[PDB]
């Protein structure tokens, strides 16, 4: 296999609508469902938004996760594996608050058989995974207003570190007139960035920790 110079999973219909997590630290759950959504499309041909709320409510203390106070994409995947399913967004809609677990196997929209973690800081391996496996869940350092106020172009933040805090989804990569980037789906609604997306600097020494903790699920 030869790696393409650019990849965009939106062009294979493997990426759902941008979501808005609202005033709730559930980025981890959106990142996890976004990665699984792509695998579901590849597996079944169906593009279905999966329930971030299912994860907030049900993948809890046993998985190190704390609902609107943060969690882990990797252990979200493990909950879906353990639970033998996750509900669709439409059946278990998102409320930007912690709720009682309400999973109902009757509305299961996807399963998960395994997940894979990529080596820390390896943007070459991240590129390979995005090209050959699908969108990849990642953490980034987003605790800078420059991130919240991003509008267009390739984002580069000299104040960034590799200590990541915010879960997002890499759905592609490319370059903008030679400025290489990662195409990142955020969960701050469509008014964020470029229609909900941010293009973050690529091959700039693991900029903002984008390749610090990548993972992706399979079905």
């Amino acid at each position: 296999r030869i790696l393409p110079d650019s990849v965009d999973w939106r062009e294979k219909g493997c990426v759902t609508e941008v979501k808005d997590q609202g005033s709730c630290g559930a980025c981890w759950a959106f990142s996890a469902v976004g990665a699984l959504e792509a695998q579901l499309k590849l597996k079944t041909g169906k593009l279905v938004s999966l329930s971030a709320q299912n994860l907030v409510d049900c993948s809890t203390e046993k998985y190190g996760n704390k609902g609107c106070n943060g969690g882990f994409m990797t252990t979200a995947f493990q909950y879906i594996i353990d639970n033998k399913g996750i509900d669709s967004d439409a059946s278990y809609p998102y409320k930007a608050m912690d709720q009682k677990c309400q999973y109902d196997s009757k509305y299961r929209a996807a399963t998960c058989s395994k997940y894979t973690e990529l080596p820390y800081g390896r943007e070459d391996v991240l590129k390979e995974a995005v090209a050959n496996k699908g969108p990849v869940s990642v953490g980034v350092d987003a605790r800078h207003p420059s991130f919240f106020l991003y509008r267009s172009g390739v984002y580069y933040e000299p104040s960034c570190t590799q200590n990541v805090n915010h879960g997002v989804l890499v759905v592609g990569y490319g370059d903008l007139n030679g400025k290489e980037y990662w195409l990142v789906k955020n969960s701050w609604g469509h008014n964020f960035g470029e229609e909900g997306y941010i293009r973050m600097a690529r091959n700039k020494g693991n900029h903002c920790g984008i390749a610090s903790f990548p993972s992706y699920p399979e079905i």
Binding site: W28, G64, N65, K66, G70, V164, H166
Partner: peptide, 8 residues
């Protein structure tokens, strides 16, 4: 080394 996705 992975931290929750704490300072939200």
């Amino acid at each position: 080394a992975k931290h929750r996705m704490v300072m939200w």
